[PDB]
Enzyme design. Structure first.
Site, short mmCIF file in Angstrom:
data_model
loop_
_atom_site.label_atom_id
_atom_site.label_comp_id
_atom_site.label_asym_id
_atom_site.label_seq_id
_atom_site.Cartn_x
_atom_site.Cartn_y
_atom_site.Cartn_z
N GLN A 66 76.29 24.77 -4.09
CA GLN A 66 76.76 24.43 -5.44
C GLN A 66 75.69 23.69 -6.24
O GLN A 66 75.48 23.97 -7.42
CB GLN A 66 78.07 23.60 -5.38
CG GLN A 66 78.89 23.75 -6.66
CD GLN A 66 80.10 22.88 -6.71
OE1 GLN A 66 80.19 21.88 -6.01
NE2 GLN A 66 81.01 23.22 -7.59
N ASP A 120 72.89 26.30 -7.08
CA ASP A 120 73.45 27.12 -8.15
C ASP A 120 73.36 26.37 -9.52
O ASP A 120 72.90 26.93 -10.52
CB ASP A 120 74.88 27.46 -7.84
CG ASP A 120 75.52 28.31 -8.88
OD1 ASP A 120 75.79 27.89 -10.06
OD2 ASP A 120 75.88 29.44 -8.48
N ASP A 140 71.47 23.90 -10.51
CA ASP A 140 70.06 23.78 -10.96
C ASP A 140 69.58 25.03 -11.74
O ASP A 140 68.90 24.92 -12.72
CB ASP A 140 69.18 23.52 -9.75
CG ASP A 140 67.84 22.99 -10.12
OD1 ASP A 140 67.10 23.63 -10.91
OD2 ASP A 140 67.48 21.93 -9.57
N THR A 200 67.52 25.54 -16.90
CA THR A 200 66.21 26.11 -16.55
C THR A 200 66.29 26.96 -15.26
O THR A 200 66.89 26.57 -14.28
CB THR A 200 65.15 25.06 -16.33
OG1 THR A 200 65.49 24.37 -15.16
CG2 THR A 200 65.02 24.07 -17.53
N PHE A 203 64.03 27.64 -13.15
CA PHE A 203 63.14 27.14 -12.12
C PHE A 203 63.98 26.16 -11.32
O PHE A 203 64.87 25.52 -11.86
CB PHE A 203 61.93 26.42 -12.69
CG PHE A 203 61.15 27.25 -13.68
CD1 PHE A 203 60.40 28.29 -13.24
CD2 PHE A 203 61.16 26.95 -15.04
CE1 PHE A 203 59.72 29.10 -14.15
CE2 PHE A 203 60.48 27.72 -15.93
CZ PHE A 203 59.78 28.81 -15.48
N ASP A 254 64.12 23.06 -10.25
CA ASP A 254 63.31 21.95 -10.83
C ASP A 254 64.07 20.64 -11.03
O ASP A 254 63.64 19.80 -11.84
CB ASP A 254 62.69 22.41 -12.15
CG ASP A 254 63.74 22.78 -13.21
OD1 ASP A 254 64.95 22.75 -12.90
OD2 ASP A 254 63.35 23.11 -14.35
N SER A 272 66.65 20.16 -12.73
CA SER A 272 67.29 20.07 -14.02
C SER A 272 68.72 19.54 -13.96
O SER A 272 69.22 18.97 -14.95
CB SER A 272 67.21 21.39 -14.79
OG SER A 272 67.73 22.43 -14.02
N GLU A 319 82.98 18.00 -11.46
CA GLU A 319 83.99 19.03 -11.21
C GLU A 319 84.73 18.87 -9.90
O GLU A 319 85.93 19.18 -9.82
CB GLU A 319 83.36 20.42 -11.27
CG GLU A 319 84.32 21.60 -11.03
CD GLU A 319 84.35 22.06 -9.60
OE1 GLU A 319 83.47 21.70 -8.80
OE2 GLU A 319 85.30 22.79 -9.25
N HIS A 348 82.25 30.28 -3.16
CA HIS A 348 83.70 30.07 -3.39
C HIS A 348 84.58 30.37 -2.16
O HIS A 348 85.64 29.75 -1.96
CB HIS A 348 84.14 30.81 -4.67
CG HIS A 348 83.49 30.27 -5.91
ND1 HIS A 348 83.51 30.92 -7.13
CD2 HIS A 348 82.82 29.10 -6.12
CE1 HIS A 348 82.87 30.20 -8.03
NE2 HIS A 348 82.43 29.09 -7.44
#
Ligand code: HEM
Ligand SMILES: *[C@@H]1O[C@H](CO)[C@@H](O[C@@H]2O[C@H](CO)[C@@H](O)[C@H](O)[C@H]2NC(C)=O)[C@H](O)[C@H]1NC(C)=O
Ligand SMILES: *[C@@H]1O[C@H](CO)[C@@H](O)[C@H](O)[C@H]1NC(C)=O
Ligand SMILES: *[C@@H]1O[C@H](CO)[C@@H](O)[C@H](O)[C@H]1NC(C)=O
Ligand SMILES: *[C@@H]1O[C@H](CO)[C@@H](O)[C@H](O)[C@H]1NC(C)=O
Ligand SMILES: [Ca+2]
Ligand code: NA
Length: 595
Positions: free
Chosen positions: A105, A108, A110, A184, A186, A188, A190, A258, A351
């Protein structure tokens, strides 16, 4: 004939070519096409989109309109008849920890995010979709089939809004609709730092010149940092307990709250940043705040990359790992680094790995208090259990010591997600992730199962018996045929996940190809990949080579006992060791001597 391409709602680009650090947006990674992999552009299309009208309308929108001569089955009816099950006994993966699900998760989040269209502000257009279930424009409601239990207790449908798309945010009628990746491409971090300059600055602690990320000032985890609250009203996390009135967290990624274990993983990574930044300040007292922030950011980025590519992908992809992601050979600027629209459904294999319960465990790895095990649905958007019920440590021990759900052709997705999903705005623990995934598949214009099999050089079943041989399951193939009528019309999410798993991995052949190809590309097409010559020094790389998930836990919790291979199924106390025996990240190579 194929145009240079659109992009009126995507802004300007200007690229500091000396910069040894990634941008926040992903811009400038690729020097010849600076927008490649940048956030807030179109997901890539590995295959042409397939919509009902060629352009934008999903299959299943217009009742009389077939796909290949047959009506597409309701998402929720596919969910009820194939995806669901009752008995949670025996579903657990004997050789993957719960951490294996959760890292999936994290990874995913990122790489991709295709958020719903923004139309229901100063406007009850969302409320009307919900209240009246009238299909139109961006409202694409998931209708309940005839015999559905939810028809009796919940109304005619579950609301569902169409994903945002580039160029206009109202519709377009000449080229096919392209959905947006808001993060992004990549790998990375994010999800920690944000993909937008706006958010990224808001997350930082600028009050001090220490390159720190901002932390909760209202609450602490026995002296350890929490994420700051998001004070944007309204909030789903307050809504799930108005007496506790604890808000969601503010992280680099919108979805961080979440579920409580995701929020948990996010907390660890935020801690890791601040910790790295403090350790660098010691070693290089002369470094300013920007420098410190950038350098910690860069190390965390490499950390995510290594855990993902060294530890996670081999135990997902198994025997297909080498076939799709051979050992690294350097940066290829000709590789498309963009996340594909189809990967965003392939990676939803996770999932089927999510189990029905989450546990809190004490320092003996035994139940923590009288309500130690909780149903997963009570933990969607749940920060209050973290803050007011023991912090993150007991949750992390559950991550280590409990198991992921194993995918099963007769028990695909737990009812915690399949019947009790909570979505923001909407009030109830009554949505279906599986139905949402299938509706989304259609929303995104996905080619069907056999189109992707062909893409992966695999056989394309045309009959019941052919589908039975591919799935190695007579009864599943028979339910899919009764619903879809031809294998060509089977939604990729469900077809991909119906395939038996490859040896040593946790996905079938088709998914291993779609995933493997993507990760290959996110590695090979990234200029800032950690192992690309010159990103880090040779010696830095010797130090980064020793990162472990166990070490991450040791450094950022008060947990002192950990397994060595955190993704395998591990039982306390046998497979657990003291944090003193686990390799550390040695930051000596970051000492920059310059007199
Ligand atoms: C308790 C655990 C989890 C919850 C509650 C959850 C929930 C969700 C929700 C609500 C969506 C949006 C569905 C839509 O609107 O189309 C979604 C999307 C997604 N989920 Fe999960 N999920 C969980 C675990 C995982 C795991 C373990 C993985 C992978 C290993 C994963 C991968 C994805 C991906 C790829 C998407 C699409 C992201 C995008 O591009 O927008 N999820 N998930
Ligand atoms: C909402 O949160 C409150 C606050 O934590 C929860 O109440 C706690 O639960 C038990 C009582 O059953 C006690 O050990 C805590 O001290 C309680 N605190 C308070 C203020 O009552 C409550 O269970 C939550 N409610 C829901 C519906 O989730
Ligand atoms: C910013 O850093 C200073 C110095 O470490 C700290 O005392 C302060 O609480 C931080 N503020 C936030 C919001 O994190
Ligand atoms: C670089 O990528 C292109 C297209 O993916 C490919 O033709 C070429 O083989 C790649 N370079 C290497 C060294 O593999
Ligand atoms: C368990 O998984 C590990 C990888 O985490 C693997 O190397 C090992 O052989 C597996 N054990 C069994 C019993 O399959
Ligand atoms: Ca990213
Ligand atoms: Na060398």
């Amino acid at each position: 004939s194929w145009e240079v391409g659109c992009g009126a709602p995507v802004p300007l680009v200007k690229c500091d070519e000396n910069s040894p650090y990634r941008t926040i947006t992903g811009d400038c990674n690729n020097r010849r096409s600076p927008a490649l992999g940048a956030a807030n552009r179109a997901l890539a299309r590995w295959l042409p989109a397939e919509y009902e009208d060629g352009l934008a309308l999903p299959f299943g929108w217009t009742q009389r309109k077939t796909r290949n001569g047959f009506r597409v089955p309701l998402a929720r009816e596919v969910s009820n008849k194939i995806v669901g099950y009752l008995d949670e006994e025996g579903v657990l993966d004997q050789n993957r920890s719960l951490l294996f699900m959760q890292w999936g998760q994290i990874v995913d989040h990122d790489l991709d995010f295709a958020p719903e269209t923004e139309l229901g502000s100063n406007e009850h257009s969302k409320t009307q979709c919900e209240e009246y279930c009238i299909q139109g424009d961006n409202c694409f409601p998931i209708m309940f089939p005839k015999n559905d239990p939810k028809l009796k207790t919940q109304g005619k449908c579950m609301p569902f809004f169409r994903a945002g798309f580039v160029c206009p945010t109202p519709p377009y009628q000449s080229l096919a609709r392209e959905q947006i990746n808001a993060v992004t491409s990549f790998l990375d971090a994010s999800l920690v730092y944000g993909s937008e300059p706006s958010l990224a600055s808001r997350l930082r602690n600028l009050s001090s010149p220490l390159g720190l990320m901002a932390v909760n000032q209202e609450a602490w985890d026995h002296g350890l940092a929490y994420l700051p609250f998001n004070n944007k009203k309204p909030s789903p996390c307050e809504f799930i307990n108005t007496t506790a009135r604890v808000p969601c967290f503010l992280a680099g990624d919108f979805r961080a709250s979440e579920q409580i274990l995701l929020a948990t993983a996010h907390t660890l990574l935020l801690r890791e940043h601040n910790r790295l930044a403090r350790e660098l300040k010691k070693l290089n007292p002369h470094w300013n705040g920007e420098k410190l922030y950038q350098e910690a950011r860069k190390i965390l980025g490499a950390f995510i990359q290594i855990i993902t590519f060294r530890d996670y992908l081999p135990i997902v992809l198994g025997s297909e790992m080498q076939k799709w992601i051979p050992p690294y050979q350097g940066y290829n600027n000709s590789v498309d680094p963009r996340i594909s629209n189809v990967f965003t459904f392939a990676f939803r294999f996770g999932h089927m790995e999510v189990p029905s319960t989450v546990s809190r465990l004490d320092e003996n790895y035994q139940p923590w208090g009288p309500e130690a095990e909780l149903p997963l649905h009570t933990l969607f958007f749940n920060t209050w259990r973290i803050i007011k019920d023991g912090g993150i440590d007991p949750l992390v021990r559950g991550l280590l010591a409990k198991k992921s759900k194993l995918m099963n052709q007769d028990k695909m997705v737990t009812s915690e997600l399949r019947n009790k999903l909570f979505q923001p705005t909407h009030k109830i623990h009554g949505f279906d992730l599986a139905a949402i995934n299938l509706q989304r598949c259609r929303d995104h214009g996905m080619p069907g199962y056999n189109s992707w099999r062909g893409f992966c050089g695999l056989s394309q079943p045309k009959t019941l018996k052919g589908l039975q041989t591919v799935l190695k399951n007579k009864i599943l193939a028979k339910k899919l045929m009764d619903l879809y009528k031809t294998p060509d019309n089977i939604d990729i999410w469900i077809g991909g996940n119906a395939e038996p798993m490859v040896e040593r991995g946790r996905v079938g052949p088709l998914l291993a190809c779609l995933l493997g190809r993507q990760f290959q590309q996110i590695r090979d097409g990234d200029r800032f990949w950690w192992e690309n010559p010159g990103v880090f020094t040779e010696k830095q790389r010797d130090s980064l080579q020793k990162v472990s998930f166990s070490r991450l836990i040791c450094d950022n919790t008060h947990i002192t006992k950990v397994p060595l291979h955190a993704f395998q199924a591990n039982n306390y106390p046998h497979d657990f060791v003291d944090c003193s025996t686990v390799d550390k990240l040695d930051l000596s190579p970051w000492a920059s001597r310059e007199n």
